[PDB]
Every structure is written in C-alpha cells, then in structure tokens.
Design a binder for this molecule. Structure first.
Ligand SMILES: Cc1cc2nc3c(=O)[nH]c(=O)nc-3n(C[C@H](O)[C@H](O)[C@H](O)COP(=O)(O)OP(=O)(O)OC[C@H]3O[C@@H](n4cnc5c(N)ncnc54)[C@H](O)[C@@H]3O)c2cc1C
Ligand SMILES: Cc1cc2nc3c(=O)[nH]c(=O)nc-3n(C[C@H](O)[C@H](O)[C@H](O)COP(=O)(O)OP(=O)(O)OC[C@H]3O[C@@H](n4cnc5c(N)ncnc54)[C@H](O)[C@@H]3O)c2cc1C
Lengths: 591, 591
C-alpha cells in the first residue's frame, strides 16, 4: 500500500512528505552549482567501480575534503559501460583510419536528462546533436552555440537552467529517408509513416490495426494509463494533474500494471493481436522487452517522442568519464577487483567500519574506511563474499536482477555511402574502376541519409549511421549490428572474420551489394555479456520485481551505500547512474 | 479455439480425430520394433545436425533404403547437447585420472521417457540408476538385470514393454543425507522434509506457508489444475478422466494458463507470497523459470515426483549418440555448417527439391536432395539464409524462441569424500600427513552421501555427486556448479583458474574447507551459451508463446521438415528430440 506511493516517489524523484521536494533540483544544485553541503565530518570513503556513478560520487566527495579511494577492476580503462573504440598511443588503432572512433556502449543523451547534459557542459566538453531520425542537412543552423540545459520542475514555477538561450540554434528537419526492411520488403520511414499498410501487412495485420504505425498503436494503448496522473489539454497536449493526484495516480499505475509484462499489457489490456505485438516488437522497440516488465518499456531506451532532442559528445562518449578521471588521478586505483566486502554495523568495533579486499587483474590487497559506495553491477556483486550478510531482500535483489545481453558490431567504411545520391554513387564508384557503377547495376535504391538509422528483422536489427563525420576524415563507422539475447549470443560465438562478413552481408540486404567496395576490412565488436565487469547491458526487471524488492535495492546496509543505473529507475540510462551517485554522495556526507 | 485442442494433442501425443492414436505407441513401434513402414519411394534426404534427433532420423531412414546425408557443423564431435568429457586418444585427458569422465550436457533419463530408454537398450548399451536423491548403499539389489522399459498407453489396456520383468532388482532406499544451504544456514534434506520451518524461516516465510516444504507448496498449488483432466482416487492417487474430457480438460489448461508465467501463477492464482516464491525458486527449481511460461515448469526438468526412477548410461551419455554414429559412418559429414538453405515448393522445377550450402569449420559446398530434415536449434537457424522465406509464423518462431544460458563446472577429486563418515575423514585425512585431521578440526559435518546432490543460493546453485564410482578408480568428479542466466554469464567470464577456485570455495561453504586436500587441480567447464552450435541449453517459451506459434514450429515448409527438442513440447529433454525425429522420419518416408 505504502510500497506503491514510495515507489512512485522513487520513480518521480520526489522527496519525503510533507515537503515533497524535487530531488532533480537538489541534484542539479549539488552536482552543477554548489558542490556538496559543507562536509562536517571528513571521512575515509571507499568507492567501488569507476563507471560514471563512481566517478561522479568520488569527484563530489573529494572536492568536499573527504579521503576517497576508487577501486576499479579494469586494469586499463575507466567509464565502464561508457566505452568508445579509439586509437590509443600504446595499442594499434581500432579502424584503418586512426582518426576514426565509434561507440561500444552509451552513445546518445536526451534533452530530458538534465543532470548528465549539464555535467558535460560544466566539464567544458562539447556536444553535437545526435540524430535519432535522419535529417535534411541543408536545414537548421548548428553553427550557433548549443542551447542551454533547461529543466522544468514539477513544482511552483520552479525552473533550472544552464545559461542564456541560444535562439539562433536550429535543429535540422527530420527527413525520414532511412529504411524499414521487414519480412523481405523494404520502405523508407517517410513512406511507412504515411502508408503503414505497406509494412504492416507483411506482419499479417488486419483491420484497423493495419493503417496505424506501431508508434500510434503504442501511444493509443498508453493513453488510458497516462490518464491516471495527467489530463490531455484542449490542444491536445498532456498536462499533469495537480501534485496530490498526480502522485496518487502514478502510485496506482504501479499498483495496477507492475505485474504486467509489456506484452501481456498489449495483448490483454490494450487488446492487440499477436501480429500487432510482433510488429511492435520488431519496428519500434525489440521483442526483448515484451516479456520484461511493463515499466521497463514505458521508461527505458525506446523511441520516446519525436518531440525529443538528443546529444552526443564530440571526441566520443569516453570524454565524459575520462575527464572526470583526470580530476581524480590520485584517488583511482586501477586493476583491483573487489572480491570480499566486510563491514561493521551496530572489520570490528572501534576500528574501521568497512574493509574491502581486492585481487589484481600483490596476491590480495585490503582497504579500510568509514563508509563505502558500491557502484558495481549486481552481476559482479553476486560473486563478492559479504560479511555480515545483507538484508534478505537486498540479497534476493542481487540474485534475481537480470542483465540483458547486448552486442554491437561496428564496420568502417572509407566513404559515407549512406549519404550518396545515385549521382554520387555514379561519380564515386566509377572514380575507382572503369565501369564499377554499371558493374553492379542485390540492387537497392540509394539510401541518401544523414544521421538516424535503419530497422530490420534480420539479425543485424538496428543499424545506425554517424550523425556527424569525423572532422577532416572522408569515411565513417557504421553501427552495423545492435541486437540482443539469442541474436547477440550467436554474434558473439562467430570468429571475428565470420562476424564482420555476416554483419556486412545483412547490411547489403538493406543498402545494396555495392557498399562492399567501401568496406575497409576493419571491424570492432563489443559483447557486453562477455565483459566480466558488466555481464550485460543493463538491469531489466521482469514483472512484479519492482514492487517485490526495488525499495530494498536502494537501502544502505550499515556503512555500505549503493549507486549505479540499477539503483535508479532509469535503467539502461546514464542519467540513472548520475542521479543515484549524487544521491549517495549527499548521504555519505551526512554521517 | 481449435488451437487449444490441437496443442493438447501435440502435448499428449494424440493422433488426429477420430482415431486418436497414441503416437508414443507408434514411435516405439517404429523406432524399437519394426523400423519404418516399407519405404516405397527411395529418396535423397538431407539431414542437418548430428545431435540425437538427426542421428535417430538418419539411422531410421537409412535402414529403410533412402539415400541419407547428415551434415554436422562440429568438426570433431557428434551428439550436440549430449556431451561427455572423457579421454580422447589424440588429445590429453580432461582430468588427472584418464579413466575419469563427467557430463557436459544431458546426464539423466527418466523411466517415464520410454523411447529413449528402449533405444539405449536396443543399442546394447548398459544403464545404471541415476540417484536424483542420495541413497543408502546397503539397501536394494542392483546386481540383478535392470527392469525392462514399460509404457502404459492412455488407451484400452494397451501397454508396451521391452522385455520380461526383473523382480529381483531393487532400487536403494532414499536417505536424503545431502544438504540445503540457503541464507547462510544449512540442513540435511531429511531434516528439511520433517521440519521445513528451519530453512523456510530463512526466506522470511510466515504462517501456514512456513511448515510446508516447497514441494508440498507447489503440489498443492497444482491440484486444482490437475483437476481439469484428472480425478484423485480414494487413495489418494490421481486417475485420468475418460478420454474425451481428459483431452478437453488439458485443452482448457492451455486456454486458461498459457498466458501465465510460473511466477504469476504462484502469486496471483495460488495466492503465494513473494517469500514463498523466492524459496520455491531457490530450493525446488531455479528462479530461471518463474518468468518463463507456466507450461515450461509443469513439464520441464524439475523434481517431478519422488515416485520417479532415473537412469544413466555406463561409460557416459555420449555412448548413445556415438553408437548411433558408428552405424552411420558413411552418411555423416563432419565439419560442414549449413549457411544457406534453398528449396522448391509448388533449387528449381524438375531438378532437386532442396539445396543446402555448407561452409567448412572447400570454401563452400552444395548439397541437393528431395527432402530435408532440419534439426539444428533455432539459435543456429536464425543465421541461415532461407529462400524462399518460410511461412510468417515459422519465421517469427525462429526469431522469438529464446534459449536459456546454462554452465556446468566439474571438479575432480582423488577420493569420494562426499561418502566419508567422520571416521573415514579421520582415517583418510591422517593417511596423508601427521595431524591433517586435527589441523582442520569453515568446519562442516561429514556429508556421508551416495548419489543425489546439494542445493544452495550461492552461485554454485546445484551440486551433484556421481551416482556410481568409475570402476577401478578411487576418486570422482563432482558437478560443483550448475547455474543459469547472470550466474552462468559471470562463471563464463572468469579465467579458468579463477573459475575453479570460485567453484571449489563455494563447495567448501557447504561441505567444509578440508575437501581441498582431495582436489586434483583438474576442472572442466561447459558454457552452453559460448557453444556456437547451441547458444544455450534449451528452448524456453515465455508466456503465450506456445499458443502464439508452436503449431507453426512443427509444420513442414515444402520439402523441409523440422525435428529437435524445440519442435517437441518436452523442451530440455532427450525424449522430445527422439519423438520429433521419429515423427519426421515417418513423414519424409511418406512423400
Ligand atoms: C550498449 C549500451 C548502450 C547504451 N546507450 C546508452 C545511451 O545511448 N544513453 C544512455 O543514457 N545510457 C546508455 N547506456 C547505459 C549507460 O552506459 C549505463 O547505464 C551507465 O554507463 C552505467 O554506469 P554505472 O556506473 O551504473 O555502471 P558501470 O558503467 O558498469 O560501472 C561499473 C564499474 O565497476 C567496475 N567493476 C565491476 N565489478 C567490479 C569489481 N568486482 N571490483 C571493482 N570494480 C568493479 C567495472 O569495471 C566498471 O568500471 C548504454 C549501455 C549499453 C550497455
Ligand atoms: C546442460 C544440459 C543438461 C541436460 N540434461 C538433460 C537430462 O538430464 N536429460 C534429458 O533428457 N535431456 C537433457 N538435456 C537436453 C538434451 O541434451 C537435449 O534436449 C537434446 O540432446 C537436444 O538434441 P537435438 O538433436 O534436438 O539438438 P542438438 O543436440 O543441439 O543437436 C543439433 C546439432 O546440430 C549441429 N548444428 C548446429 N548448427 C548447425 C549448422 N548451422 N549446420 C550444421 N550443423 C549444425 C550441432 O553441432 C549439433 O550437433 C540437457 C541439456 C543441457 C544443455
């Protein structure tokens, strides 16, 4: 009963009654504006894990005078699931062009995630637009300074922002020239949007359902749910109800729908057919999430709203964690994997409150302190021996939280053929050989797309083209394959050469055999399940798990505090890790 | 509506109306007694995959005169998910004792799986009892010949059997001396059976639930379901209702419960608490199956009935597929992975009906024939290009069927310490060093167990001890770790040395630190997800998947027929693969 209101508070970043403070305001205050409240006690803090959560918490707590040590199992790299392939001075380069880079993990940051964007700005880092949908490159004006970060609180005309507006900045126009290739037929997204029957009949859709895009189908199925906490305007836009029944509405969403997977919600509640769910699970999101909890899809990484604006970091996503890491060169210990965690909650009495044993990745090493923030995924925590045991429900959450399997395959091309008009294909193909153009004319139209990506039901699933070229380069690296579960597992068990052949072949199925001429022979692969420090992409709740034990996930265990994407309810997002990191830094500062 | 009756028929091995023949009778007739009906057409048959399904189908169809070729991707091994670690004449031995062997895949065969057991007998192979529960070794009489295989049909006093009874054969008495270690407390199974409160309170169980074993909890939750098709006797044993409403009852089980996961069935229908489900998911089966379909647990690999008897093959489970393979040395082509499947359904007209391209594991190889039986898992089929496309629902089943991740870790010991009394620990520990015994007296009681295994919630989960010693050997190989999902993924990403240390340590948590002295330093690991020809343990349906598309799984596509565990509804069992193999052999014999 109160589980439901407390979960909606955790979900909505609402403080305890009766003040009901906006925690995102507090977090932006701390992280961006002030730093932490005057420390008071200066303490010895052990932070486990140098992903974004540990780096944000450690950078806060250190600047407040505490004695901080960050233990990182990886011997060469910080950032965790933020991972960019790029040329390193020791090693060779990942691609044939040493200037080329590409993402292995996080790649896009939404405008509705203010903590992270503001953090990137405060670190003096540059951001460009990330084109979720492919754009018309002769529209808008990106030369202007990026707009500031804006956040509107749920409260009394309370807003937060980063700086002055930049009215001369204009996003390019969505062009939707990219492909949907399902059931061996293929259309531009613009064609699918106006006549969804072309693709939907391929999934054996009939009746009313056939003439809706899967986006519309999904948004119509959700409108009665949105009604719990909001009213649609005259416009019709949505307006949140006043605070109380806005909060009591969300709490009844949790009560009514947490035992639903997204698929059972679509079949039994929205009354959609098997074929409608199959198409939704193919075009919009993935069939990953249909057996996952309803809440994972209504809040995770999905085509949120064409309304939304996305950003990327110039020079790679790694710039965020690696800049924070340089600020913390004295605190970060690399190559030390926590294998044992010992703590005292009223080591031992009088002495240190926490003791952590690490092992190198010089047989063991013991660390001590007063407080600890554990930010490692539960897939890692599972194999740490903890004494005394955690609370029962916390132990169950470690055992029962699943991580999803995801793999990214990246292919380097010497030219950005996805931008080519058929004219450009003529000019550039023949520039290499006498009649290379005529030699191909397995034939597809020219994609001629800037940004965005294509969707398919072959094992490549989602394909993304780089939003922006690497300055001074002539080619680009395509995210050729981004898939989950059994798809990802089969990707992982290929030899490297087989795997890039398969990814290239499936790319040709969409884009045309002739893309092969621009393939440099350089691929990279990231099998997040093969990563011993992640063992997956993100925490994914199955139905009922969130009310079963998520409140126990966030509770501290004596001197041990917890942070990371899995502690938030923004699973699979950077913003969830940054939120819970600030939240933990505030808490261990308190004592 | 008819989907439900046809699924119950597929489930119950009932032929079409109005004859309603017992297919298991037909399969035992064909496979064991006669061989196939006179062929008629002698044809050219391509079989893909040399697991048990392909070997059973090919051995039948060949002995009926057809021209059969079995294409096997693995370059060194047949049997697929039937895999025994053992000494090979080329390679070194898996363990320090070259006589030692242990299972990587299938290990136990139930008496209620007659096709397989009869097949093992007909191949002149030897079987011993597999002790699911640890036994009193001075009870029963295993010297006598094993009892014959008996099957009672659902029909009119129709029974099948293998041979004459063997009344002098007696199974040993269950002793339940093995451990349950959950929530840092530990009890013998015999103690848990009489006073389940000891373990159940560890899971925070209250009230009525606390005094039930999780087995009782599960069986009581299922009694109203069993009522759909059966009536419990006066005894009370269960008796199946007469045929019609026996079949109409099962069809309403499918209608009423297929949209339930096992967990939602326990929480919402049986009305069990979160803690009761947590304990059930820990002791009885695994928390694997709670988000899987209700039907996967009511039929998969689980503590079925203490009633049941299990068998193992002497010399290893590999003896079954490898004996069939020697009968087929001319038909089996090793090291050829199907990458392309082409077929004609009214190559091309007049010519061959099926064409299969393989690649070596001599750049490509093309095979042709009239009919094909594809027995490879859907995780492999996913990456084969098929032209023309399969039926829509068949393509969706390939995309949407999930395979579960399972890993087995095996540890060799020079002695069978799990059998030791404390006396034997004294005599044998001190036989190695002056006061080795006193040196240890991390202390646990002596296990003193023969067969069966122990259950825990640390990452090892289930631990099994060998039912029988290897004749003329003094030690044994323990299945130290058998786990799924995130547990298995973290097991897989350890170095080999780390992984066996972790498995040994968790074994010591249950059995006592002193087992280390008998550890030879030899481990083996099978990560079924890392296996490119399996990519998992077994097909696992999520809720509603069985009615969504399982009838489409079993349908042929022109000249292409399908077989394997996933085609049956006995997922994760050998018997399901043998059933669908016989079924396919019968069908392609028909033309
Ligand atoms: C493929 C992919 C794409 C993504 N795309 C996006 C996106 O577009 N936008 C977005 O917002 N988010 C995205 N994310 C999510 C985002 O990257 C993560 O949620 C976030 O980076 C997780 O941060 P964390 O600190 O919680 O965990 P982690 O990054 O996993 O940090 C944990 C750290 O702890 C270390 N560690 C682990 N075990 C131990 C141990 N035993 N001892 C010591 N150290 C240990 C690890 O080495 C690691 O450095 C994506 C994630 C993936 C996998
Ligand atoms: C850990 C584990 C324990 C088990 N324990 C038991 C048990 O106790 N009792 C029980 O009854 N069952 C058990 N099983 C289940 C049983 O082993 C399987 O269900 C059964 O062996 C599967 O047989 P199959 O022929 O359907 O598939 P497979 O054995 O997988 O056979 C498929 C074959 O096809 C080959 N192949 C794959 N892809 C290609 C390709 N592209 N081209 C060519 N060839 C290809 C593979 O190499 C393999 O040889 C267990 C399974 C596992 C994983």
């Amino acid at each position: 009963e109160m589980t439901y209101e407390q979960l909606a508070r955790e979900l909505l970043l609402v403080g305890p009654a009766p003040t009901n403070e906006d925690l995102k305001l507090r977090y932006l205050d701390v992280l961006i504006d002030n730093g932490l409240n005057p420390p008071g006690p200066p303490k010895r803090i052990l932070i486990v894990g140098a992903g974004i959560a540990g780096l944000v918490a450690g950078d806060l707590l250190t600047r407040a005078g505490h004695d901080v040590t960050i233990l990182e199992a990886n011997a060469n790299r910080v950032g965790g699931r933020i991972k960019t392939f790029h040329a390193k001075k020791g090693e060779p380069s990942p691609f044939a062009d040493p200037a080329q880079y590409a993402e292995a993990g996080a790649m896009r940051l939404p405008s509705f995630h203010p903590l992270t964007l503001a953090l990137i700005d405060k670190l003096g880092l540059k951001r460009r637009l990330f084109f979720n949908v492919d754009i018309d490159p002769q529209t808008g004006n990106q030369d202007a300074p990026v707009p500031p970060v804006f956040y509107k609180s749920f409260k009394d005309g309370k807003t937060w922002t980063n700086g002055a507006p930049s009215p001369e900045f204009k996003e390019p126009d969505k062009r939707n020239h990219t492909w949907i290739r399902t059931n061996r037929e293929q259309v531009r997204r613009a064609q699918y949007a106006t006549d969804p029957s072309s693709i939907n009949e391929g999934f054996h859709l009939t009746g009313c359902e056939t003439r809706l895009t899967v986006s519309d189908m999904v948004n119509q199925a959700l409108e009665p749910v949105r009604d719990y906490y909001s009213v649609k305007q005259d416009d019709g836009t949505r307006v949140n109800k006043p605070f109380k029944e806005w909060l009591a509405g969300w709490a009844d969403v949790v009560r009514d729908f947490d035992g639903y997977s997204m698929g059972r919600f679509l079949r039994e509640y929205a009354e959609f057919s098997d074929e409608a769910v199959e198409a939704i699970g193919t075009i919009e999101n993935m069939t990953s999430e249909l057996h996952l909890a309803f809440f994972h899809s209504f809040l995770g990484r999905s085509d949120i709203d064409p309304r939304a604006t996305y950003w990327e970091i110039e020079g790679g996503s790694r710039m965020l964690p690696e800049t924070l890491a340089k600020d913390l060169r004295d605190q970060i210990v690399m190559g030390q994997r926590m294998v044992r965690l010992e703590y005292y909650d009223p080591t031992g009495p009088g002495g240190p409150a926490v003791a952590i044993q690490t092992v190198p990745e010089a047989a063991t090493q013991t660390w001590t302190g007063d407080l600890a923030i554990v930010t490692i995924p539960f897939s890692s925590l599972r194999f740490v021996k903890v004494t005394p045991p955690f609370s029962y429900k916390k132990r169950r959450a470690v055992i029962e939280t699943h991580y999803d399997q995801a793999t990214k395959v990246l292919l380097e091309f010497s030219r950005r053929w996805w931008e080519f008009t058929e004219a450009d294909w003529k000019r550039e193909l023949d520039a290499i050989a006498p009649g290379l153009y005529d030699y191909y004319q397995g034939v597809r139209p020219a994609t001629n797309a800037y940004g965005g990506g294509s969707t398919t039901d072959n094992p490549n699933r989602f394909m993304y083209y780089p939003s922006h070229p690497v300055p001074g380069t002539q080619g680009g690296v395509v995210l050729a394959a981004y898939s989950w579960s059994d798809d990802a597992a089969r990707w992982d068990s290929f030899d490297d050469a087989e795997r890039y052949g398969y990814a290239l072949e499936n790319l040709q199925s969409v884009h045309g055999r002739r893309i092969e001429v621009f393939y440099t022979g350089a691929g990279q692969t990231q099998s997040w399940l093969r990563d011993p420090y992640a063992c997956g992409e993100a925490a994914v709740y199955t139905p009922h798990q969130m009310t079963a034990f998520h409140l126990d996930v966030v509770r501290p265990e004596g001197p041990v505090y917890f942070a990371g994407e899995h502690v938030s309810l923004k699973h699979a997002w950077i913003e969830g890790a940054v939120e819970t990191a600030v939240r933990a830094a505030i808490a261990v500062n308190e004592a």
